[PDB]
Amino acid sequence: VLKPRTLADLIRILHQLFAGDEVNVEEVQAIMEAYESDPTEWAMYAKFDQYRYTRNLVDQGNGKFNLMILCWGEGHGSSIHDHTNSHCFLKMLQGNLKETLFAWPDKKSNEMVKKSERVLRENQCAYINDSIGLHRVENISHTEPAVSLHLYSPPFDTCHAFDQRTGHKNKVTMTFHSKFGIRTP
Numbered sequence: 147v148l149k150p151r152t153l154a155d156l157i158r159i160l161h162q163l164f165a166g167d168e169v170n171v172e173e174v175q176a177i178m179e180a181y182e183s184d185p186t187e188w189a190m191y192a193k194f195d196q197y198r199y200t201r202n203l204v205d206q207g208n209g210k211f212n213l214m215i216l217c218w219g220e221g222h223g224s225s226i227h228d229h230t231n232s233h234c235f236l237k238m239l240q241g242n243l244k245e246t247l248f249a250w251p252d253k254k255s256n257e258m259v260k261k262s263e264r265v266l267r268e269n270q271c272a273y274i275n276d277s278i279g280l281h282r283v284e285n286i287s288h289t290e291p292a293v294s295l296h297l298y299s300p301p302f303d304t305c306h307a308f309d310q311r312t313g314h315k316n317k318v319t320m321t322f323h324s325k326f327g328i329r330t331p
């Protein structure tokens with residue numbers, strides 16, 4: 147696999163990968179994973195919040211995708227969510243995330259079913275889409291932070307958040323804590 151030597155190279159390569167109409171998921175996953183995380187290259191995007199994780203936009207991929215960095219503070223986690231019909235890749239940059247895959251709820255109301263559960267390792271890149279399942283992702287440590295790099299294509303502004311007890315969902319607008327290293331409003 148082609149190995150980006152720096153986040154810049156990776157981004158460059160991504161522009162090519164998503165330039166077309168076809169996307170080789172396997173191939174992208176490989177290239178994201180090959181990139182060996184280097185805090186020096188991404189610290190400018192590593193802006194944490196005390197209470198919840200943060201989204202820091204990194205690149206807009208010429209409209210073809212969103213490359214962002216999420217910063218999980220001690221014990222921070224996400225909700226069980228979908229991915230608005232887009233491709234979604236997440237690669238570990240620091241620390242470890244526990245990913246739990248869930249099955250889509252029905253009209254009926256009741257406890258959501260876990261389909262898979264694992265821990266993403268160092269520099270590991272995972273992949274997901276709506277036809278695969280819903281998921282929840284969490285920092286496994288209560289003393290160290292976690293940092294992941296995320297790519298969505300096409301990009302999307304909203305997602306659904308699921309209630310693990312009933313499967314009830316609600317629309318959520320996704321916001322950014324910072325863009326291009328710049329804290330937002």
Ligand SMILES: [Fe+2]
Nearest residue numbers: 227234281283
């Ligand atoms: Fe997700």
